[PDB]
Design a protein around this ligand. Structure first.
Ligand SMILES: CCc1c(-c2csc(N3CCNC[C@@H]3C(=O)NCCC(F)(F)F)n2)[nH]c(C)c1C(C)=O
Ligand SMILES: [Mg+2]
Length: 102
């Protein structure tokens, strides 16, 4: 249904060169101040796990999680940091692929 498109998008994000910051949850033990600043963490493997057990009712819920990944990225990382730069590439990728399905 709407979920077949989400499988395609998520697969293509997981394999993207710039996905390396977002494949795994941030470990707050390793990242000073992350727990304080980011209220709702999100990453591609959490989305993949939620998709695998069917925890998305609509495509709009899937997109909310994706946008959360990149909102969190821009909140915590400078736009010219290595992670910020990758997050902009991944955000533009997502917005572009989402639009040529809907
Ligand atoms: C900047 C942290 C961060 C990552 C992320 C995922 S893998 C990775 N890297 C691994 C290899 N190269 C170093 C670099 C790194 O700095 N890791 C943590 C620092 C330390 F202490 F472990 F070295 N960073 N992803 C997101 C979404 C992040 C944030 C805060 O938004
Ligand atoms: Mg937004």
């Amino acid at each position: 249904s709407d979920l077949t498109f989400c499988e395609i998008i998520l697969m293509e994000m997981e394999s993207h060169d710039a996905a390396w910051p977002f494949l795994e949850p941030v470990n707050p033990r390793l990242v000073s101040g992350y727990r304080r600043i980011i209220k709702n963490p999100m990453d591609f493997s959490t989305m993949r796990h939620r998709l695998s057990r069917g925890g998305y009712t609509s495509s709009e819920e899937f997109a909310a999680d994706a946008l959360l990944v990149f909102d969190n990225c821009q909140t915590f990382n400078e736009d010219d940091s290595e992670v910020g730069k990758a997050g902009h590439i991944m955000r533009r990728f997502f917005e572009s692929r989402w639009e040529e399905f809907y």
